[PDB]
Amino acid sequence: MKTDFIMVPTAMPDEKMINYQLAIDGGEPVIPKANRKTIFPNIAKEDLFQMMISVQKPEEMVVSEFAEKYRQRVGAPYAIPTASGTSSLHLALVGAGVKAGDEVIVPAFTFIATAQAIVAAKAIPVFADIDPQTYCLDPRQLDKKVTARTKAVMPVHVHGLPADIDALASFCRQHQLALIEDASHAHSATLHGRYCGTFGDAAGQSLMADKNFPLGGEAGIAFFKERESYDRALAFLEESGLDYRMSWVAAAFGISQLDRLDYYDEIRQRNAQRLIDELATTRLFTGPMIPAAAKHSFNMFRIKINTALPEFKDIPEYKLKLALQQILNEEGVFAREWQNTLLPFHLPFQNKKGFGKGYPFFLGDSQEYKHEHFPNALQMLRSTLVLCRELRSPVEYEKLHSYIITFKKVDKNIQRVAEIASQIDDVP
Amino acid sequence: MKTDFIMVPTAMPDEKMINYQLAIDGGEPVIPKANRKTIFPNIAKEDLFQMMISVQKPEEMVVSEFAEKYRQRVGAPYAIPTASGTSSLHLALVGAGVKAGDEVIVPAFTFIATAQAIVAAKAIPVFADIDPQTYCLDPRQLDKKVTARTKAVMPVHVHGLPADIDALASFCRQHQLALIEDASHAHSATLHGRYCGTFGDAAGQSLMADKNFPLGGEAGIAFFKERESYDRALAFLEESGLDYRMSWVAAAFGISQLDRLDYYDEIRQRNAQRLIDELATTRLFTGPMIPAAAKHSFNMFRIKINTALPEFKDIPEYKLKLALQQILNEEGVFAREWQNTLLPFHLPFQNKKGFGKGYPFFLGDSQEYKHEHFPNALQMLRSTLVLCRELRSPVEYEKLHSYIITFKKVDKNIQRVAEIASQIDDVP
Amino acid sequence: EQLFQVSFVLARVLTSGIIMSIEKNENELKGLENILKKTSSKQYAVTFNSISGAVIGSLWGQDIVYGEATNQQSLDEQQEKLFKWLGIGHSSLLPEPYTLHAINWGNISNLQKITHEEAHVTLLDFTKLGFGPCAVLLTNNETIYKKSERLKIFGAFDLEIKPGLQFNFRLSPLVGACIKMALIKMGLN
Amino acid sequence: EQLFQVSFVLARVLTSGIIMSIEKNENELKGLENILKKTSSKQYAVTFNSISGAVIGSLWGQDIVYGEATNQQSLDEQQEKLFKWLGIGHSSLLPEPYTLHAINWGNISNLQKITHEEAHVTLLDFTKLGFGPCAVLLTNNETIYKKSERLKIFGAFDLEIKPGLQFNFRLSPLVGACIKMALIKMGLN
């Protein structure tokens, strides 16, 4: 039988491993090789049985059943199930009244699919910089983005942290713009006790198997505030001839998963909050900043590196990041980057080909972006590492404590971190 | 969907709760009401899928497949799958050459089914006392119980602790007796690195769903050392006309469960060993004693109460036990008894009816058993509590730590334990 | 079709997490019993994990124990041996202890006609359904019922009828649920 | 028998824990592709979660983009609209972009005859199998293949061909496995 089941339990790590030799220098790693796997999503008996239930019903009913179920929980007036998060965002934009040629304000830092939803709506992305702590669309650097073409602002609840809705909502009503959320990371994330996806005129949300609330492979959902938006998005599907329908198989997994979401979320919250608190004691690391009214879903956990420590004098930040990545990965914590380059400088937004002949892009004033336009986002990429699956998975206490030991172990070797970083060869 | 899935995770308990007021006196319980349930057995996706595999195959093949698989792991030369542990013991006894009228030495403390296997073999149970620490058949007493009729000694690996095989095996070979193990609790338990069930000439083992290694409901297995025994047991089934066959459904669950047994056992071991170590620091409690060569399976965790503490001067042991039971149960640790009465004084061995007219019993000089014959076993019943499901389940760290806090909390209230115990009404 | 229905029931019960005979909130065996009681019009039902358990129940239920005798004219070679092992003799002058009906996929549909009879004890052998060894005893006799349960270790000891030797003839809920399903599919409301 | 076979395959893949398109050790989609490549005798295969994705792949793969035209004589009302949305015109004088075959439970058995054709781009729509929206593009054209993958977000970025607009037309492994099973049961190796 082919199973992902982990056969070795994660032993409680000795607190004395903080004094141990680093694993990169032939030391004992905090997390042994056998204990480095995690299971995601959490596939239980319920999920297998749910397939046996749903298979007996009409596929469109299974999809409808899911859509309603999740909608009620989120608290969105209307919802459309779709094959992907990308398609949901596309339907969200169009539904909210984004027409061909319109400009849409988006953060430079997000997944490609955010912007490719804008281009799919035949609109032009206007990339903006991010706040250096929240990592979300910066409301301060937004005056300089507005034109006669600007129709909507599309903030991303990146990592799972709700973006500055209160500020961005004021900007939208002021300039008579529509607000479209990308909640593809913010499953169960809240602001003022309200779930992400209910704030904007519309919103899109990935329901892929790599998200805190996973469906059975590829899937997504679009939320709309007013019915006129929901109807327009439906009317677009009629006119466009696009088939963005969800698989019942995918929906079925969602139905069962939703019954157990709150359980997993609770472990996720307590695990993350503990790690924040522990990283607060470290000189080298700092966990994500969270506004008081906000609740982080912790799809991704981005850790800030203090590159300005004395030991890291004439060392460029990227070398520190790379060294820390190698050091942590040897200990067993797979820290990594989420986005290597900002969307402006991704090939699609360099060639500006779109549908062809640069269809969306030539329908408005051409923008040659440069790195100097996004200083905050670039500082983040140089001076942060990300934990993804390791805190998206609701890991047991022994595993969470292993993480805490790892950072505290590395925090006691800031000198060696510096020595290793300085030995890294230069790059473009 | 009807599911046993627990929706509330067990919060990490504050270690300051050791100083808290007892829950019986209106204090906050260490374990909240919502966190008092445990799941057993551990039913995973693998188990559901295994049913879908096995259902397609001939039922007798599924049972054969299981029998061999588990046999190889245990390291027994021969094995017969059966419908129950009781039937396995019956087949074990007969297979080992126990004939009608023979006497079989058994502990007074065990489950009724041990003795009812002897009676099913048309043999006469000779009840003996137990060691006060291991709680297994006491080898020192075995001189006083041997007669010309005595054919076999049947020790029980009770709780999961291997019995004193070394001593009992010497006694058996000396008096040309057969050794028949009851390993119904000792799944994965070892002595000198060998699994329980391989030591005796034959052995029986429950594979019921309440055992560390569970099958899908009712089931058991008989092990035999030599083929002579295996053949006789097979020949008995032919002659007796008894249908003691196993269900494929039950076996199927075993096949999948066996793949993940070592994982669960490891958590079980580390959890138990931690609790022993922590109870060693307490003045009031003591965990199970384990010989050097032995490994406990921890199907049940029996805790000794120090009834000889000064605060418990003129307080009878049973009142201390009852008070501690009420105190612990209010905190959320459901400590209880396994056996309330010794088998001699169970109705079957008072009426001595057997098959009818006292068939087995009238074959031999009947002894009138009295409580003064089993002082050690009776001391145990008065001065021990048992945990059962709470440590048979491979509980998470948060839950295990909750237990440790509870005992340490109660250990700081030995005075109040005494006050509560003294207020309990007498019982004849 | 059968493979799905069987798998579905096993999945449902496994999802419930209630797979012990003696566990509270186990309603698969009671459900099985109720259907059979309604079909047979009998007041009492006792489930076993073996035909032997149903046989022993019917015998000991009528005080046909070691030293006694009954009519063995309609017994197969297996039950002949079981009676001998129990220590029960033959007499043509006495009545038969039970009427045994071997149930399979052929005749399960027509269970009403089979069970509607006027013997003291109806024994149903479900083993040939292929869900594992299983048997049910049906009677209006309360004393047979009570003695049949007391024969089983954990039969009505959930807390008169003094028990002698006992066996584990408790049926696996999982097995019970499969048979319950089979019955429901083939009529027998 | 269908309900079991479907359930079994979903259970198997769910047990494996490999249900992401982009995940390493995902071999359900590759397995599906291989079967279709062998049946059609085509060298390249690209799976989609929508017929639209297969259509767009075939068009953009032959540089039929915004402003270009092709033959739409064999298109249904839906494809007509999709082409219009892409900004592609009609001409009777030009060749057809693809030959589309809607696969269902009626014709799945006779897939060899359908797929063995001279058409340089074969599009298979599996949506009506009822496992969810799915389509596969088959060609010997390497450039069509490469462009079809690159138009999918995470298609050949698993790590000449610069991508423009992109969509998520990645197929759910679970869905892919169901179709793979269906094919294997209905004659195809």
Ligand SMILES: Cc1ncc(COP(=O)(O)O)c(CN)c1O
């Ligand atoms: C923020 C964000 N938005 C959108 C997407 C794409 O969503 P989907 O793959 O469900 O279309 C991703 C990546 N899965 C993402 O990280």
Ligand SMILES: Cc1ncc(COP(=O)(O)O)c(CN)c1O
């Ligand atoms: C020592 C012992 N023997 C036998 C049994 C009964 O086994 P079974 O229920 O499988 O017949 C038990 C209790 N499960 C037991 O503790």
